[PDB]
Design a protein around this ligand. Structure first.
Ligand SMILES: Cc1cc2nc3c(=O)[nH]c(=O)nc-3n(C[C@H](O)[C@H](O)[C@H](O)COP(=O)(O)OP(=O)(O)OC[C@H]3O[C@@H](n4cnc5c(N)ncnc54)[C@H](O)[C@@H]3O)c2cc1C
Ligand SMILES: Cc1cc2nc3c(=O)[nH]c(=O)nc-3n(C[C@H](O)[C@H](O)[C@H](O)COP(=O)(O)OP(=O)(O)OC[C@H]3O[C@@H](n4cnc5c(N)ncnc54)[C@H](O)[C@@H]3O)c2cc1C
Lengths: 461, 461
């Protein structure tokens, strides 16, 4: 079998399906729900996601679904992203349900089989492949299975993969409320750290606000106990110091679980997204880390089933993304550490605000919280023989790219790699780079080791 | 009489006494102990203390009692003080008992009456004076009383000044241990943050080490209970992961108390040092803040009893030093926030450690924990008509100084101020400054308001 089964059709699963579909791999996603769930948990995507979408032309399809914004924070300490030199993306306000719809439409348009209303009840693997049982008794078979089935992943559990980390005492609530004009909660728009905990209030409709509260190190009802509107109102009054009234729609709990799968791969079974790491939802790193799992994995998986992957390519998924996941965990825990009561962390918060005043600190934190590092390039304009283009347009094909910016290499000739010569530009501080299909820089002038890079990621030529 | 009574002859009381002695004020210090106590709680003084000692020639008297060192930390994150621009002081290693001996020696040489073996039992004031009673049944009378009587200050209590702040859960032990050669505790020399808490091991004699343990947010015996050696042995094995044995010379508890007097002045009664602020003992800010209390207060009190103090000059002691105390409080609390277990603060500690690699963060933190800001100058070499000097040498007489570095003002004529003309130097970023007797800049070119500054701090010309 040459088929990849994706367990779960959330944002990470759907992104992975898009990657595999672009690569031309036979792919099936099994998703329990008949549609993306509403209301959306998330209302924004960070620089990591924006860039990874752009290098596949996915942001254009989201153009009219939301808006660019250029704000960021570290544990609700305001940062200034537009002061940061370079050309890295900023953030984008859009409900995650809409992101999911665009991703699903893209995946289907690429030939991926999407099976909604299909519950996985059982997961097995043999030396010859992968087998999943659905709630209708059907067995679906493939070469590989990827658990993108969220925090509580059935795939992770059935694979025997431990999920270590912590479940802190935390009282977290959220919901959409229809409010009247003049509603006191409208005086608390934004995400802020108050004396006792966090409260975020955001307009999501002409008469509607999303309200989120979170208080650390305090008792909380169990996560599947019903949330009465009076509980949310009491939290808002206690934390935000304002009276909430209105007509509640959605009301639910959320947790401060911070856990990561001990390994991202077990034979023919792999993990991505929330199944692989469940982190505190801050600044878009939670989804961002999952989306970048998907992009890291897609092309490696494809190369593997198509027969041209170097022996160790698929193992580099766990190696790179478990490290990246641990760094995301570290960043988000560093943040939640100072989201305790101000009686306990107020002074350190004020110190950090002061430090964030220093240009290098602001740049450091904006990049960290956006999930941005020097492993990928910015989407910079380029001029080639075929005219004007840019770095990320070269990556839309989903193929490796040797981009020569004046280093003047003899044209690299590898069946998996596209050689592109472009005029020099000051906006990239390398005269040549080798880009993996996920956009990651595998080599750059003037480093030695170009052939080893080529062979490591694409095989010999 | 017109006598200043100082309650307490610790480092802060004795420094205050030296300041008053320099200014020619009749002064008595009442101190419970027959001699500075051993063992010393502290073994180093920070940049603030070194500078304030230097501007009175006191470091000279200490030159053979210890040694300069150039290390610093923020909650045991190592810093690099020598990378910092300026001519600001570093640290000095010396037991505090010896500092006390030198300060008392200086105070006596200036004619201060130092009465040891004296228990103060009650303190009172009348419109015309202060009255303090001793355990032997005598009354000491004066014009002003200053409480330098430590953390448990009787003077603070009897003046009815509240001591708000916090007393975190904290298990702190310390003592001096005579150990056998090859003792495993010598494998842990230094002040370090471990998994569970902090431990400092410091050689203090050929076969004697000081050992200090501290663990936050765990149960502990009350601070007045006795320490058995077994308790310290367990703490060291638990925290530092090493076996301690030997013969203890002294064992006691210490707390993470962080409190500050609501006001530093109540009529003719004032507070300084630990009586004014009890902070976490870390990096030298605990003593440093007190020493600068003493230097701030001395000349102002002198001006008050000599009749040349403007009406609100003594009040400025509370305004400045309370503010400075609050900042020290905020600083040290910031630090203790990340001295919890690494299971709770490890990621934030690692992040901060990375940020401290940025030059401006390193500078910010070194200056902060050294108590150093822009309110005083460095001790820079100067060239005057009378030959070579330095900034602090001009401050040893304890008078205000109008230091003209090429601004070429007409000679300032003020009975409390010395006008000094020096050649330009690149090591001071002003062409002229007005220095208060505590070394603090009251005015600098090209600011307006030289006359106003003169009148504010030194009265009418
Ligand atoms: C309250 C809250 C607010 C948040 N806000 C943000 C934000 O603003 N920005 C941000 O970036 N992130 C945010 N996050 C985090 C973000 O929602 C997740 O990181 C993201 O949804 C992870 O995507 P995923 O596809 O891995 O998992 P999911 O979105 O959970 O998708 C997993 C899918 O698998 C399906 N599934 C599960 N089990 C089975 C089964 N047995 N058979 C078939 N299908 C199955 C589920 O139906 C689901 O569709 C927030 C999270 C919470 C809780
Ligand atoms: C374990 C420990 C380690 C420390 N380490 C450091 C360090 O490394 N660096 C640092 O800078 N700081 C350190 N400190 C803090 C430092 O010791 C204090 O900040 C400093 O001693 C304050 O000086 P002070 O003169 O205000 O009070 P004290 O030093 O407490 O002096 C007060 C004096 O008043 C006398 N007194 C009190 N009541 C009466 C009374 N009724 N009658 C007569 N006399 C009285 C006492 O005998 C005492 O001599 C440490 C503290 C502790 C507990």
């Amino acid at each position: 079998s040459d088929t990849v089964i994706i367990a779960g059709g959330g944002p990470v699963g759907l992104m992975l399906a898009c990657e595999l579909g672009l690569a031309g791999v036979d792919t099936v996603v099994l998703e329990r729900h008949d549609a993306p769930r509403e209301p959306s948990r998330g209302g924004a995507i960070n620089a990591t996601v924006v860039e990874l979408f752009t290098q596949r032309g996915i942001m254009e399809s989201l153009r009219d679904d939301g808006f660019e914004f250029r704000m960021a924070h570290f544990a609700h300490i305001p940062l200034a992203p537009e002061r940061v030199p370079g050309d890295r993306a900023f953030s984008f306000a859009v409900p995650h349900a809409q992101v999911e719809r665009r991703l699903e439409e893209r995946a289907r348009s690429l030939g991926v089989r999407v099976r909604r209303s299909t519950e996985i009840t059982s997961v097995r693997q043999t030396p010859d492949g992968v087998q999943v049982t659905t709630g209708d008794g059907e067995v679906v078979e493939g070469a590989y299975l990827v658990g993108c089935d969220g925090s509580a992943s059935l795939v992770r559990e059935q694979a025997g993969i431990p999920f270590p980390g912590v479940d802190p005492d935390f009282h977290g609530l959220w919901g959409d409320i229809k409010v009247e004009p003049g509603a006191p909660v409208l005086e608390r728009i934004g995400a802020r750290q108050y004396e006792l905990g966090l409260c975020m209030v955001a307009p999501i409709g002409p008469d509607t606000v999303r309200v989120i509260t979170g208080e650390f190190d305090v008792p909380s009802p169990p996560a599947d106990q019903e949330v009465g509107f009076d509980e949310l109102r009491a939290a808002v009054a206690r934390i935000a110091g304002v009276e909430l009234d209105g007509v509640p729609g959605w009301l639910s709990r959320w947790t401060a679980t911070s856990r990561q799968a001990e390994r991202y791969r077990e034979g023919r079974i792999l993990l991505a997204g929330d199944a692989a790491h469940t982190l505190f939802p801050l600044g878009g790193q939670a989804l961002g880390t999952g989306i970048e799992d998907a992009v890291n994995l897609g092309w490696k998986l494809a190369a593997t089933v198509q027969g041209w992957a170097p022996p160790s390519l698929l193992d580099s998924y766990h190696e790179e993304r478990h490290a990246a996941g641990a760094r995301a965990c570290a960043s988000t825990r560093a943040q939640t550490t100072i989201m305790r009561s101000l009686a306990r962390v107020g002074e350190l918060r004020a110190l950090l605000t002061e430090l964030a005043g220093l240009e290098e600190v602001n740049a450091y934190l904006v990049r960290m919280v956006g999930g941005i590092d020097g492993s990928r390039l910015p989407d910079v304009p380029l001029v080639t023989a075929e005219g004007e283009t840019s770095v990320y347009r070269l990556l839309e094909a989903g193929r490796g790219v040797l981009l020569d910016l004046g280093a003047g290499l003899p044209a690299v000739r590898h069946p998996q790699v596209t050689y592109v010569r472009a005029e020099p530009t000051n906006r990239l501080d390398a005269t040549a780079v080798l880009l993996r299909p996920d956009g990651v820089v595998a080599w750059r002038a003037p480093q030695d080791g170009l052939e080893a890079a080529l062979e490591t990621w694409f095989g010999p030529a």
